PDB file of C-alpha atoms in Angstrom:
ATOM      1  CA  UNK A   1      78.576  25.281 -35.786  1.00 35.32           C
ATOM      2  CA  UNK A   2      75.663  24.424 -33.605  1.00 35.90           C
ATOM      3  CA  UNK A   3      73.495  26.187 -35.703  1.00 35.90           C
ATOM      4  CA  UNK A   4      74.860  24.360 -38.431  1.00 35.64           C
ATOM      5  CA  UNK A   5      74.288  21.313 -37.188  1.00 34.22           C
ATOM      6  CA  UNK A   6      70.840  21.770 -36.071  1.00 37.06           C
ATOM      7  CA  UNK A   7      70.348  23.497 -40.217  1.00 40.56           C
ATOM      8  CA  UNK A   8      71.383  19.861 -41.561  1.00 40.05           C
ATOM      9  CA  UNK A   9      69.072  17.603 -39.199  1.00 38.99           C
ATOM     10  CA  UNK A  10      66.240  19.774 -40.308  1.00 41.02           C
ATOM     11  CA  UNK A  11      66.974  20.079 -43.617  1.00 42.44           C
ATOM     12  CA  UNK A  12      67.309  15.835 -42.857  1.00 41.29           C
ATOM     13  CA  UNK A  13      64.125  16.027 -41.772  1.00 42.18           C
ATOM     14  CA  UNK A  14      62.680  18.171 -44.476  1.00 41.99           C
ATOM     15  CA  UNK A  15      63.574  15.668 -47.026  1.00 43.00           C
ATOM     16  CA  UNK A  16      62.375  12.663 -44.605  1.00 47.87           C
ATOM     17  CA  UNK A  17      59.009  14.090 -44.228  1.00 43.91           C
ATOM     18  CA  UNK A  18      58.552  14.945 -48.202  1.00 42.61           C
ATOM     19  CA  UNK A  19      59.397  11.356 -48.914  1.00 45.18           C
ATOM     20  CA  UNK A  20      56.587   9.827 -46.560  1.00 43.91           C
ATOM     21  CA  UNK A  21      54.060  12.500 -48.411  1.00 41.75           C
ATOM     22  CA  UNK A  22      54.880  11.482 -51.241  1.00 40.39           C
ATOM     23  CA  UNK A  23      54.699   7.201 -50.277  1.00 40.71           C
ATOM     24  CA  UNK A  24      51.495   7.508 -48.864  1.00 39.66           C
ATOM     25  CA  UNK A  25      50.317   9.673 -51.804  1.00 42.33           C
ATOM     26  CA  UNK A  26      51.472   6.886 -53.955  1.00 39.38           C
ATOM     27  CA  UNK A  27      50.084   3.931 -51.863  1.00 36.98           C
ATOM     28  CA  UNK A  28      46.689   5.678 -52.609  1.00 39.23           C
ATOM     29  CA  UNK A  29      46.918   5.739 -56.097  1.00 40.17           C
ATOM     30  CA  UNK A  30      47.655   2.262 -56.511  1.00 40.87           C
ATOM     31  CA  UNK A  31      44.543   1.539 -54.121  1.00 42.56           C
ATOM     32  CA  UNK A  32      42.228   3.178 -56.695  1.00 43.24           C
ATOM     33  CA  UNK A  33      43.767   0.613 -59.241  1.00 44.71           C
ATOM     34  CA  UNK A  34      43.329  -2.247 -57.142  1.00 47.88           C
ATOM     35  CA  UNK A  35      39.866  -1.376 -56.382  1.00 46.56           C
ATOM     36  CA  UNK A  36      38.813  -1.452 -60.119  1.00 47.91           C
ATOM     37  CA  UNK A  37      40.885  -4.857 -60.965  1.00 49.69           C
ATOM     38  CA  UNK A  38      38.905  -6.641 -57.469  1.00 50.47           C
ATOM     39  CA  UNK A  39      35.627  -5.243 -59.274  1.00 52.44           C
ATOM     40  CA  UNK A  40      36.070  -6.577 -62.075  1.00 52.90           C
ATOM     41  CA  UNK A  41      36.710  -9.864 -60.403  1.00 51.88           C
ATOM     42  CA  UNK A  42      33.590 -10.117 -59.266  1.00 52.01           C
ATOM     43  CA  UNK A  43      31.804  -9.639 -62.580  1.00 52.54           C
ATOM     44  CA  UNK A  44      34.148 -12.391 -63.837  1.00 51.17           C
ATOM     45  CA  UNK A  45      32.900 -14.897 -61.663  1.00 55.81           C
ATOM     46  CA  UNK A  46      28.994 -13.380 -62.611  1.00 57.84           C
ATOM     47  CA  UNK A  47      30.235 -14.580 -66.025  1.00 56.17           C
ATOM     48  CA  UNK A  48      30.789 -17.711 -64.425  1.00 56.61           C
TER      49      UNK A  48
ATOM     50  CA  UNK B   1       5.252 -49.909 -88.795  1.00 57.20           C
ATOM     51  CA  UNK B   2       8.748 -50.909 -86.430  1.00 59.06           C
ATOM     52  CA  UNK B   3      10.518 -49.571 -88.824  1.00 56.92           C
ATOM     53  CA  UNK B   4       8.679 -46.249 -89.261  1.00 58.06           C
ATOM     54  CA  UNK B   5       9.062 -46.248 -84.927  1.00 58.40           C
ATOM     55  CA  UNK B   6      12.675 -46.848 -85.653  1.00 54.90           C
ATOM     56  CA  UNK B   7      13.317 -43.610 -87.325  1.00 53.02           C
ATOM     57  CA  UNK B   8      10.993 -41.799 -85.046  1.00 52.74           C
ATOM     58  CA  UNK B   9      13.534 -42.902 -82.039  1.00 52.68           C
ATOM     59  CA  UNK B  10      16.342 -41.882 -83.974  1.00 56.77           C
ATOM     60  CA  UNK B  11      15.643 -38.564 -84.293  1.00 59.67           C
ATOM     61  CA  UNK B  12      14.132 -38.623 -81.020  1.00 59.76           C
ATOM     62  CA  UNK B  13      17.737 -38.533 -80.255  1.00 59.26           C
ATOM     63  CA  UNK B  14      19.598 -36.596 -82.848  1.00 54.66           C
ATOM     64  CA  UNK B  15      17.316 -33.845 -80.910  1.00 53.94           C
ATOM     65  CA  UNK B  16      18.869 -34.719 -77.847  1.00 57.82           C
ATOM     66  CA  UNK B  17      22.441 -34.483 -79.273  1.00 61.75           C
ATOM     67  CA  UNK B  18      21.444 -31.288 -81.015  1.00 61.95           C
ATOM     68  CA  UNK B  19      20.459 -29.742 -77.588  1.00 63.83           C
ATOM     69  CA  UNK B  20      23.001 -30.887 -76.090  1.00 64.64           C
ATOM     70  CA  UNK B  21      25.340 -29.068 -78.891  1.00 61.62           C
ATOM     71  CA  UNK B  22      23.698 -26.062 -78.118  1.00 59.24           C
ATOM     72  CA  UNK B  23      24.084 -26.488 -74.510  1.00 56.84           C
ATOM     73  CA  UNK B  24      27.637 -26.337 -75.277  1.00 56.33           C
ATOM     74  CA  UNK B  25      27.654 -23.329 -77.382  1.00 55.00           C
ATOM     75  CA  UNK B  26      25.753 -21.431 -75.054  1.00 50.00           C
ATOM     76  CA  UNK B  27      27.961 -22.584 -72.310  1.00 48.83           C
ATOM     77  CA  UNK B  28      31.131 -21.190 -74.329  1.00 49.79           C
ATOM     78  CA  UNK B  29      29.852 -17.951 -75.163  1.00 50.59           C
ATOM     79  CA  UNK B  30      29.658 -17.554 -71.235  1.00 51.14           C
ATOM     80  CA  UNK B  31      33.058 -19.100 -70.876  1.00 56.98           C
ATOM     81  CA  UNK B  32      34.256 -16.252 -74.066  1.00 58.33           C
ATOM     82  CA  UNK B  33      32.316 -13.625 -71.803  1.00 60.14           C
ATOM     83  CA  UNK B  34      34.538 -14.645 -68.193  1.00 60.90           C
ATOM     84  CA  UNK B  35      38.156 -14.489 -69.620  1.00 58.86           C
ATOM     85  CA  UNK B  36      37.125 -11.385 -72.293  1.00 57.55           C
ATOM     86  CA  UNK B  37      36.456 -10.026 -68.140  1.00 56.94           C
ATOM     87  CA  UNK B  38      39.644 -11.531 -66.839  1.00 53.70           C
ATOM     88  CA  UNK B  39      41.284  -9.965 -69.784  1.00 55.64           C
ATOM     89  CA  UNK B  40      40.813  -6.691 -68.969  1.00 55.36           C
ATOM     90  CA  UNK B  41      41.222  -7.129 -65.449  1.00 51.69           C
ATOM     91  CA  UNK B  42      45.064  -8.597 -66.788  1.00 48.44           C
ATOM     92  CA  UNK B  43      45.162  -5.356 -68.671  1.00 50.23           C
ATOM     93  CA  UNK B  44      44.538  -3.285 -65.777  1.00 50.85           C
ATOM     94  CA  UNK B  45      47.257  -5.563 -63.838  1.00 52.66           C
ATOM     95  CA  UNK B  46      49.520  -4.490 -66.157  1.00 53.46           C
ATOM     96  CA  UNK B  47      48.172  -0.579 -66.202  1.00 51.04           C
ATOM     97  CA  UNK B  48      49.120  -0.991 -62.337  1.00 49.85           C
TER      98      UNK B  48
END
C-alpha cells in the first residue's frame, strides 16, 4: 500500500506536469497570433 | 467687361469646390485603405 500510494501521487503528478506543457505550449501559439493582429495595427494607423 | 470678370470669379471657384471634391475622394480611398487593414486584422481576431 505505500507503494501504492506513492504510484498514484506520481502518476498525479505525471498528468499535472503534461497539462502545464501543454498550457504554456498553447500560450505561445496564441502569442504568434497576437503578434501579427498588433502588426497589422500599426499599418492601420499608416493608413491613417 | 464686369460681367465677363463675373464668370471668370465663378469658375475661379467651381475650381475650388472641384478640389476640394477631390480632396475628399482622395481622403476616402485612404479611409477604404485603414478599415480594408482593420478588416483583416478582425479576421485574424476571429482566426485567434
Amino acid at each position: 500500500t505505500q507503494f501504492g500510494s506513492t504510484l498514484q501521487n506520481i502518476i498525479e503528478r505525471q498528468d499535472a506536469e503534461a497539462l502545464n506543457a501543454l498550457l504554456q505550449n498553447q500560450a505561445a501559439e496564441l502569442i504568434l497570433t497576437n503578434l501579427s493582429i498588433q502588426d497589422k495595427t500599426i499599418e492601420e494607423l499608416d493608413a491613417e | 467687361i464686369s460681367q465677363s470678370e463675373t464668370y471668370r470669379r465663378r469658375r475661379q471657384e467651381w475650381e475650388i469646390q472641384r478640389n476640394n471634391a477631390e480632396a475628399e475622394l482622395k481622403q476616402i480611398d485612404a479611409q477604404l485603405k485603414s478599415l480594408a487593414v482593420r478588416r483583416e486584422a478582425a479576421v485574424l481576431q476571429k482566426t485567434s
